[PDB]
Ligand SMILES: O=C1Cc2cc(Nc3nc(Cl)ncc3Br)ccc2N1
């Protein structure tokens with residue numbers, strides 16, 4: 001086509017979606033990770049995770065307001081990944097890398113899994 | 125912080141939200157523009173438009189499944205802007221620029237209004 | 249704005 | 253991935 005493109009549009013959209021998340025506006029699901037609860041937008045979770053995409057396209061699970069993750073999932077690893085979904089920034093540290101990688105594999109977040117594998121390979 | 129950032133994340137999120145829109149997945153509102161209807165995600169509309177942000181943060185309108193725009197709004201201008209919201213690409217043409225600018229002013233989409241004003245100033 |  |  002003959003379209004023009006606004007370079008910062010995608011980043012500005014995500015920044016605003018994160019602002020809605022911070023003020024708990026139009027969040028439509030609670031993700032339960034052991035004793036912790038995380039409110040989010042189903043659409044953002046689906047756009048970032050192969051697991052949430054599969055969950056919310058299911059004719060029965062699409063209507064659930066609460067999703068319980070596997071008990072092996074670490075709440076801090078989930079929190080770091082939820083922040084990454086809404087910001088593009090990943091708080092990857094020596095102390096959390098194993099939990100973050102395991103959570104990203106479970107959530108089917110291929111690019112996060114890739115950088116975790118590379119950071120782990122550099123330290124061996 | 126000491127975060128790392130995935131450059132293409134925001135663009136990949138928006139691409140996936142547009143894929144959900146194309147398959148009519150988790151759309152939660154109909155925007156009525158005269159005889160035309162447009163299905164969309166409330167969160168994406170709020171993230172792109174000062175008007176939709178004001179509408180869906182209202183304690184009564186946040187719950188509406190149908191929103192009727194002012195009858196002066198052109199359905200083609202709206203369609204072009206809805207496409208821009210989900211893609212960052214604006215199909216701006218000599219034949220549609222006046223309708224697109226008027227629709228962007230009504231929707232409170234400041235960056236679109238700015239480029240329309242500049243393209244109009246260049247042709248005078 | 250750019251030409252994509 | 254980059255240093256932002
Ligand atoms: O690593 C990742 C990230 C991700 C996101 C989605 N999400 C969607 N995929 C498609 Cl094709 N359409 C709409 C949506 Br929402 C699917 C798989 C994966 N794997």
Ligand SMILES: O=C1Cc2cc(Nc3nc(Cl)ncc3Br)ccc2N1
Nearest residue numbers: 016019170171172174177232233234
């Ligand atoms: O030209 C524009 C585009 C736009 C978008 C929003 N959307 C939001 N703004 C804020 Cl501050 N927080 C969350 C959201 Br969603 C507000 C105003 C405007 N004006």
Ligand SMILES: [Cl-]
Nearest residue numbers: 109110111112
């Ligand atoms: Cl990813």
Ligand SMILES: [Cl-]
Nearest residue numbers: 233234235236
């Ligand atoms: Cl804009």
